[PDB]
Amino acid sequence: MSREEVESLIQEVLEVYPEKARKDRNKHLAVNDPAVTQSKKCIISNKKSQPGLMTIRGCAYAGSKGVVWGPIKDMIHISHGPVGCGQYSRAGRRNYYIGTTGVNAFVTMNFTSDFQEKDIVFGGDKKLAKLIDEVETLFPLNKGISVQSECPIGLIGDDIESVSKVKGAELSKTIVPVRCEGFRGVSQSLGHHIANDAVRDWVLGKRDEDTTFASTPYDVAIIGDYNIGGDAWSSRILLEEMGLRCVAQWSGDGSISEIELTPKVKLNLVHCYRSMNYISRHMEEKYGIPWMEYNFFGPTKTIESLRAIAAKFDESIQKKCEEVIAKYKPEWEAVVAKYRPRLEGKRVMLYIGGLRPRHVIGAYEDLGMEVVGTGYEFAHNDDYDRTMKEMGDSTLLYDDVTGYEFEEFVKRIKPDLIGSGIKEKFIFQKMGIPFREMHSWDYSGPYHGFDGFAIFARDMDMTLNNPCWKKLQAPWE
Amino acid sequence: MSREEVESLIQEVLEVYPEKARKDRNKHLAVNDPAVTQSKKCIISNKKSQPGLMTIRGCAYAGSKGVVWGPIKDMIHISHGPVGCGQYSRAGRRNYYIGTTGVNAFVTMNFTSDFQEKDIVFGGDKKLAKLIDEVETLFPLNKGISVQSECPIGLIGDDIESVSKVKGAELSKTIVPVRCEGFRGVSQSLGHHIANDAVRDWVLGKRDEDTTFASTPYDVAIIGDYNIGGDAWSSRILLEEMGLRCVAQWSGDGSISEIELTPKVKLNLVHCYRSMNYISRHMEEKYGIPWMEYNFFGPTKTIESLRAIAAKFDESIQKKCEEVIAKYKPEWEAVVAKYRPRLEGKRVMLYIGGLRPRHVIGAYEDLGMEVVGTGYEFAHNDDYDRTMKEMGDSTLLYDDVTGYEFEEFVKRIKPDLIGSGIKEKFIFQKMGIPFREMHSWDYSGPYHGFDGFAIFARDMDMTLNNPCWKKLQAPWE
Amino acid sequence: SQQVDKIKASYPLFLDQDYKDMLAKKRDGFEEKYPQDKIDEVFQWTTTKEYQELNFQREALTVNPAKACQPLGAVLCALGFEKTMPYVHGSQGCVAYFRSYFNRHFREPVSCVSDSMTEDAAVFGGQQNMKDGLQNCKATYKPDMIAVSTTCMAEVIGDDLNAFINNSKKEGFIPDEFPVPFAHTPSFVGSHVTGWDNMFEGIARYFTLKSMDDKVVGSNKKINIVPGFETYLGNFRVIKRMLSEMGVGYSLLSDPEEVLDTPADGQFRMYAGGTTQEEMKDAPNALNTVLLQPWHLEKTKKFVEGTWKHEVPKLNIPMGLDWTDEFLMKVSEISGQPIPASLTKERGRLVDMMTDSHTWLHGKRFALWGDPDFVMGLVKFLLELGCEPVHILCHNGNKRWKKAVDAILAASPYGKNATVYIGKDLWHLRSLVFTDKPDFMIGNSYGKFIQRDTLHKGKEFEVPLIRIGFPIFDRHHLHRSTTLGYEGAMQILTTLVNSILERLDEETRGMQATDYNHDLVR
Amino acid sequence: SQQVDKIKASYPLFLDQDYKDMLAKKRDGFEEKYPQDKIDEVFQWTTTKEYQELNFQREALTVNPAKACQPLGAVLCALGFEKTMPYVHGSQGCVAYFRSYFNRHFREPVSCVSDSMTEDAAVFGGQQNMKDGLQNCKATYKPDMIAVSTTCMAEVIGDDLNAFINNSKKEGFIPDEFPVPFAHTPSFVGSHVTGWDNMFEGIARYFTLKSMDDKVVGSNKKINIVPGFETYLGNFRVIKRMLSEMGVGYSLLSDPEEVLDTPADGQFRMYAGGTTQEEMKDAPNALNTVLLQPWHLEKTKKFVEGTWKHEVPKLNIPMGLDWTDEFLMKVSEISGQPIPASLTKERGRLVDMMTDSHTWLHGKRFALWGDPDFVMGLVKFLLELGCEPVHILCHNGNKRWKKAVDAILAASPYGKNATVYIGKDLWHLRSLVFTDKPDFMIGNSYGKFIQRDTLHKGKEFEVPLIRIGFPIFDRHHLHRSTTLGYEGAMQILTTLVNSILERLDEETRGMQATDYNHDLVR
């Protein structure tokens, strides 16, 4: 469907760049073909971003502190370095939790060492030790400390591992050093990798010798669900209604004890492959725990995932799964009947990065909506391997898209709706195109599971069919 | 001082008027002489206003509905006529009460007949009967209905007395017709008289044959205290601390049962002589109940009043009175020590119709403040007789002052502070003179009693020494 | 007892234990109060649908009305002309109430006089009161003009204003050249907006009726603007600003913005600004006359079309996006001035705020009340925002206005749940917000009591009040706001969205219970 | 479960019984949570004076700071110039954070680029990144100027911006005449306002240092205005409007109001408005230069006095009555233009509002925080209103500023109970509002958590928050407000008095318990 016109559009958009940038960016733009299984032959990913082209990517500190470690509610996370880093990431991500903030939970708080000139010149190891003592004095109910390194920590010669070991031995407390300096890697994905390495090396093996936890054949762990707006809770309710027991969830509303208990479960249910596959494979190799990916966006994927998960267990779990599906069928059928006629035929172009862009397509298709373009900030080739069969023919694929590129693509394709982050929202609202934040769910949700599908459909309807979009052109012009 | 200067000021102010208005207004302005105990030879009052001179006075409906009958919490007061009257009078007077509004209390509500053209042309007796039926339907916990007439009721020939009699006999309900049409009289004073007559005729004698109430030798009734900012509460506690029992409270936070129980008390304590002297004299004549005026403005007056009241009973009440005085002495002494240095020597002009300008002067002098001019919109000659001995020599007295007159007097005298109503407040704030709303206590208070004295001193200090009054002149003029 | 270092006013002084014991003793001893169980049962009954059915059968009783009487609006209209004293022929209690009522909401001095008619005037009429009052007012306060309205006393006794004023002039009480326009303003007809209309039509007739021979339409190259009963100074100011931005010659009529916003610099100014007599005299020479609030300016419209021969446009109140656009386009067509780029950018910025706040505004349910033009403009704007007006109440509305609002509602999918009520009071609205609960109320300060009642049923039933309209007595300086034009739409949108967000923060503040949704970013 | 007709988002969906049962089982089974009595005891302990003593002994740990890093302010300053791209040499995560943070505050697009330095640049430097980034940015986004700041990465590795940009020019990556001003903005020194000052000084030095020979002071008859780090558009508007009313020629420098307030009309405008390069080049020809926020414009002051030879006046931020009067008088003295009557009337109207609201404002106790100039202006205005600032916190304040604020407090009887803290964070302020409870807090959105904590102690201990400052994330369109001049003071006074009145209504809404003081009129 106009496959040649898409390639022509790619060439005209690339015309602006200088030769080196154009040659680099040409490999990150592709026209989808569902037949192709190896995405490397068409699109290149996980590369450094070209300087000065206004990328959307973050850093490794965002991927480690912001994404993986931050949702752990009962631990205190120290942004080690200058003040800006923790201030910009304080409570920006909606990883929900239950607790008494400042007493036993510390998710929305910003703990930092706040370096000055003297800390840069002479180092900050003694200051880190004094900070750990002060933390132990003022927050006695904390259950662990992580130290997230910012750029100067790596640049200057600080050695936080020795401080962590000495202070942890002194205080009988778990202190996890994370070398998540923002200049490492090319995006948040290296932050995920570093955070998972720290998890295996400092937390995951505390209870290897412990056998006081009572286990059941129906023990599962949610891995890579960060409870954005309550997503993990909406998934966990469906899992428990199926008869399973969810020992742990990583890492939204997560506790350090849940992480320590994870090696005792029978199955790992991985939601975000991209951020947690590392620890999932490590657990499979070390503990013999199988892991499987699942999708809870939209009723179709939810039912498929529930049936596949129940297939891993005995017949009673399968019967309970059938009961759950039959119980929830009328609700999502009513949601479809109410909202599909008002969204049928609409076209969407979504850039989120990570796992979400190919992972929410089924929900859009459940409402009769077509995804004509999709792309990632920091995905790898395996993510695109899944995406190509997830998307339709002659659609646009794009990795680490620039601001200019995405604006030109949106002008040419003219979608009815765009799903992306906070740094594109207002650009495209001024263009007159409805926009939905997909990282934060526009401060709404959850969208996972059957309960979340209703909210998703309501939100898409309310933004797409908003009467404000018919009023940008003044009547006199 | 300078009595001659004050008389010259009076003459120059009067020069503007036409001959008839000047001749009338000259009788209502005077220079005080404390030795003169006959104010009739010195000042004229309780006369009709001069047309077109922007008077401050209200109407008889305001004096009856707004002042006397309105505070009664368990009765429903129907403003009978067009819609304007009750709407402007709705909840504009801070007559405090305890109750559940709309269920058992109806003080802040506006019940009205809302006449249209057809009601004016054909009458409103049938409408009044249907209205009373609807009131009984929708407010079953009301304990009585009063019908306050507005101007057209008296102008068109409506017989509300017969409707009240018929409907009250039909429903076993107390229905009190009040002919308080605004065109009767010259001010709110005739409204007071009419309301007291209605109380005497329809409510007061309902329990004359009843003897089931147990009476004590220490039974008193507070008459003429309308609980502005909880003023009557702050008095009542003192009376209850002296050992007396307060059976009734006319009419702030009052109930119809208290009014009916009033003829069983041993003493009547009248606060406002102007609005309740009529019923006090009637009850002395009919029941042999003595009545006495008291004053709870400022520590000196309240101590004197408590001693005088206790002198009416036996020695135990006197002992309790001395105990109360001793208990409250340190608090008002501390108030004086804090606030007299801030207010010593300041001069005040007052203009409130009725008892408050004479009553407040003792509280003002307790803080070392001099009252240099005072006046009442509706006071009779008996009120002025009481006033002349309480004011200093060669001070200004003025009855039913016009806006022009009061503005010129203020410009010449230049008081430090002015206490009047809401229709003078912004005029004199724009002139740069601190102003206190005496009728509403500037939405503050209470000012009665020992507890009220502290609030009074704090309010006077906060307004008189406000840093805003030093900033009306811009630096470049 | 008081602590001199921390003195308590009535709240929370009367929450002390001694006062509580006193009040309990008083209630138990002498009030004969109904048992609390019976009180609770009766309140619960009053929040039911059966009570609502009884309440809506009322024919004679009005409880908590949402309107005033004509002379208040007449006084407001008279205040809009230069050095004009509002003069009210009748009883002085009316003038006391009008002045107090305007003083509370404005927080500014209001000048108005009465001739103080009494029983004697009720028997023989008010000729002498009129003569002496006019003489005294002119001598004392020195106005350039005296505008005369009436109280219900004078209307019922049938005082002839024209004859009284003429007899005053022929007998030398006031000079024959002194302008004394008059209007009959009966309080048992219409409401305060009707009084504003009557007063304005009287003044315009007085200055133009007998001098129409030399008037040519469009000769002065201006447009007349008649605002109507208006209590937001920002509305006058934004009309003037938008007209000046387009380079349009205009003549605002009955504008009081200066006299109600005088500075505090050590002197009292009784008069300030206002439409001049020359402006009123030259008004028939304008290109056209625009009525900002046509649904209570019908008599003025009749006079302007029949006498001035101006073809008055059919414009709604310039509220919201579409109606402001229509008003500006009509002004441009009448005057021939193009709409400038500054207004286009202002419109775009309003649209930008709409797209920014739509996710929080969408689907919210509102009950609202006020005057007809204001109500219909607010309903139109709410429909533009994707909100749901559920209970629309106008106590002083009529049947034609109700059909117009129904037509507006039918043009949008968001008006499907709306019902319009005319001739209903705030007790009706209390029943409505109990039985069919909206998200918010929009109205004047009298709504606060309704909010209190809903909170008594429970926190989950409380309907917050948003103060837009007249009068507002329990907040300071909200009369400086704007509701007309793009600026007014921006202010209203900000108020609405931040009320929604403030309520959301209130509902999610409980630690470990609901604060999981206590988001930093909204 | 969901009902299709009334769908529930997270609140109150997760208040359902099944979700509560799920969460209870999760907590009791796998969270190993401390018992609720222990949690309550520790929380009560953190509200005590002993905990406060421990809290203020902190030396290494910072909890909940109230400041950001320099490049954020550098980007804000760069955005104020015509067709200028903010370019941040260093790591890209910094730029992502800056853009998202400004997007959440202003709800507008924020354009900024980086050269995306990685581990390779940590040992070889960022020359190649600078060359390629400048070439790419100029080719793609077509700026007229590129303003370069630094992240802490580049600052630690000691990248030489001047050499890098010169080498980029001499090897043909960018034209030699293309303006590329630069500034070193180390995040471990100062805060975001320091970054603004550094960026502005770099731009001014780039455009004026090498062309001072032909410059004559006062030849263009204008006054330069330097606003500093400012996040209220209304402040720029009010400064320009006041200067235009006086008829005073002026040249605002680094003003971003247009690019942060572009309309939604169907196109995206990356650039709009801003200070032109010609204005910056002609700035030394002005009569004088006024610094609106002198306490974070120290380096700019040194440059302007040393190089441009302007006698910069000693002026406070024009906040509140006295300081605005001093600013207006200084401008009149410099320019020779008398103060017009419109500004005199505006000042009088502000004074009138002060007199109207003084009874409700008097004696109220405020804790407050923010940037130094804004904090001191707010403290000055609060003293003018008769209010009592109790806890004054400025995380990025210094000792000289603290001495100045102490001098201001000692000049008023209302500053007797005030304490000024510098270098303290919002956890310190939480201890302060627990142990010495004020009536209200004034600050940015981060204060909401503090309010939540106090409400957890009790309703009688809750300290409401008033959102004035930067950033505000949980309300919409407050960035359009004004806090400068008589118009700015009017808005602040209205917000304060109405917050007080709204709290009072909340406290007296209880039926038959506290509603005796629920007055219609306030």
Ligand code: ICS
């Ligand atoms: S962790 Fe990843 S960018 Fe898998 S860094 Fe990012 S809360 Fe995205 S597409 Mo923000 S790999 Fe989670 C993500 Fe996906 S922060 Fe969230 S929405 S499913």
Ligand code: ICS
């Ligand atoms: S009743 Fe009278 S005008 Fe005696 S009509 Fe008036 S609540 Fe005044 S001086 Mo308002 S004779 Fe009471 C009065 Fe005094 S309403 Fe109050 S303050 S003590």
Ligand SMILES: [Fe+3]
């Ligand atoms: Fe005022």
Ligand SMILES: [Fe+3]
């Ligand atoms: Fe925006």
